[PDB]
Swiss-Prot record:
<feature type="modified residue" description="Serine amide">
    <location>
        <position position="39"/>
    </location>
</feature>
<comment type="similarity">
    <text>Belongs to the glucagon family.</text>
</comment>
<comment type="function">
    <text>Venom protein that mimics the incretin hormone glucagon-like peptide 1 (GLP-1). It stimulates insulin synthesis and secretion, protects against beta-cell apoptosis in response to different insults, and promotes beta-cell proliferation. It also promotes satiety, reduces food intake, reduces fat deposition, reduces body weight and inhibits gastric emptying. Interacts with GLP-1 receptor (GLP1R). Induces hypotension that is mediated by relaxation of cardiac smooth muscle.</text>
</comment>
<protein>
    <recommendedName>
        <fullName>Exendin-4</fullName>
    </recommendedName>
</protein>
Amino acid sequence: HAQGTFTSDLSKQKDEQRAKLFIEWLAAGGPPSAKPPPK
Ligand SMILES: *C(=O)CC[C@H](NC(=O)CC[C@H](NC(=O)CCCCCCCCCCCCCCC)C(=O)O)C(=O)O
C-alpha cells in the first residue's frame, strides 16, 4: 500500500536515526553523557 510514502519515509527515517542513535547513544553513555534520548 502507499502508506503515504512521504510520511512513512519520515517515520522510517526517524526509526533509523532513533535506532542508530539508541544503540550508539547507549554505547556513548545514555543520559549521563548529556546527549538526547532517541526522542
Ligand atoms: C514524522 O514526522 C512522521 C510522523 C510521525 N512518525 C513517528 O512518530 C514514527 C511512527 C509512529 N510511531 C509511534 O507512534 C510509536 C508509538 C505507537 C503507539 C500506538 C498506539 C495506538 C495508536 C492508535 C491510532 C489510531 C488512529 C486513528 C485515525 C487513523 C507510528 O507508528 O505511527 C508521527 O507523528 O507518527
